[model samples]
Target: EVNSFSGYLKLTDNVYIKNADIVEEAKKVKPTVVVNAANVYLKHGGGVAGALNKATNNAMQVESDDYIATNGPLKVGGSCVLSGHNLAKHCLHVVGPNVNKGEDIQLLKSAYENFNQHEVLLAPLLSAGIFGADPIHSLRVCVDTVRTNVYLAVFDKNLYDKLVSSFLE
Candidate 1:
């Protein structure tokens, strides 16, 4: 499903939605920063994190570990910028809460909140997936919906279809 896509929507001048492979589009769409929905420890484990590591031939992990050694582990709903991989010049590593609470929601939004004039940011559902956040809630707070130019890349079929259905109007 490299070239295959479900749908596309442009909610504003800076916000775009596409159901394409994120890693592939990071090369094709060429964002200024790529988001890594990483763990607190930033291990090069499975899912999106693993894909990014593969693209960089494991250098993503190298720099991530190097970053941790000096700066310490990233807290939930927090982020830091790595030197990035070959795909983009900067990689944003964001960790999210695994449980839903009033505070978790706030923390979850905080991850997206930091996008801040980043130009083009290639991102997925920030606090979803294994992080145990509701995709719809995460969608509601995809960084103020207009703060920066975002090319939101989605790989999950169900979530992609839902987003397109909601905004394709």
Candidate 2:
């Protein structure tokens, strides 16, 4: 059921790196919180967000909609906590900067910062998937940003291989 890479790598202190499907692995690890690459709108419509929503039976989606209605859309680089439903105790949805932005790394850092307070976290490669941010560049920022127990789940094998070598360098 797990799709993780055969090898595991470490990125600095407190951050563990691997090729993994966050949707499946997060459920296995059952972290205190899970980080989601989400739009400012928090739609949870596709990709990992959608899978998470589906796994939780849409409870997260309803909670997120209500959260946004009260607080307005989360700005790029910001994050907010909502229900993780059956997955984890909480889900921290983050908005990454669009690749078109003047600077994506800094914004990406702020997004990761929002949930670093949690001790045990399962996170995907923040901002790299549908957001179109550079994964190697973003991985550097992610390694630098997290200061607590963190799991960096890379869903694609090609990416996981590419990124692991980058960290080795």
Candidate 3:
């Protein structure tokens, strides 16, 4: 017999903020700031493993440079969000499917099981002032979507393993 598993996280209330950009409609109710971009700290001189400010996990462990898939020539600042935060900080955000190098197709499918944990970052926003919308309700939808994207990316065994190995060493 196999045991059943279920997980649930809490949602908190959101505060109200006035006069922010329309692009940032959803996030203004939450409390994140421009400084969140600095949390990622990956500069050109930094080695492969990169430096992490675990104090806040606001940065992407994998920089845009890490994307194996690129179009045309690679430009340093183009498409890169330099606000010192994720582009989504004040705008809508989108994430593509995770890419992994696998020994074979079977291994590739199995790797996704690891992507299940991305939802962890969602609810705190409602509890935070990142959006001034009703803490409990305003961010529910977007947060859930972001959580899904994060989990999907995280579950890539090869991707996660390589990233961990690079940083740990």
Candidate 4:
């Protein structure tokens, strides 16, 4: 059921957020699709990407590279393959906004928009974690554009609270 938190909607019954490790939480939820906030080259070497790579036995990196080779460089908002070994059945590696290149709300929107609509989705705070994206702005864009049932994996509680507060407000 949908529960309201200070005016913001949350799936309290679904228990989307977990205090435990994201991979472990994912194991319990068994989401069909997981998302990796990746770079233009699609390397799963740092931040959320790194964790996903380790959890799925580096298959994410291998599959991403294979997809990249054929498709060429991905722009921010593009999605590619994330073939996992034993994790989610499929993964969507989306290139999020690079703060160094300045914020592009359109790019952020495109990334989330490209995600396949699925029953359950496990995604990270795109660009905010490692790419230095503005958390509040990015979250707003994601909440507005995402089509699937998205569950964000947040490593920092304080940041999560901050974003949630903004989302609620």
Clash numbers, per candidate:
0, 0, 18, 0
lDDT of 3 by residue, 59-95 (tens): 4433333532343222211122222233233211111
Residue range 1-169, candidate 4, lDDT tens digits: 1211122236343324423345664566566777778888877777777887888777777877788788887888887755645667777778888876685756777777776455567777777765777887877776666656667767777877887677667
> lDDT by residue for model 2 over 90-136, one digit each (tens)?
88888878676454557888887876778777888877876778889
Top candidate (TM-score): 2
- Model 3 gets an lDDT of 0.24
User: Top model by lDDT, which number?
Assistant: 2
Which of candidates 1 and 3 reaches a greater lDDT?
1
lDDT of 4 at 149: 66
Q: For candidate 4, give the lDDT of residue 25.
A: 48
Task: Spell out the clash pairs found in candidate 4.
Answer: none
Error of 2 at 19 (Å): 1.5
Q: What is the TM-score of each candidate against the true structure?
A: 0.85, 0.89, 0.19, 0.81
Total colliding residue pairs, candidate 4: 0
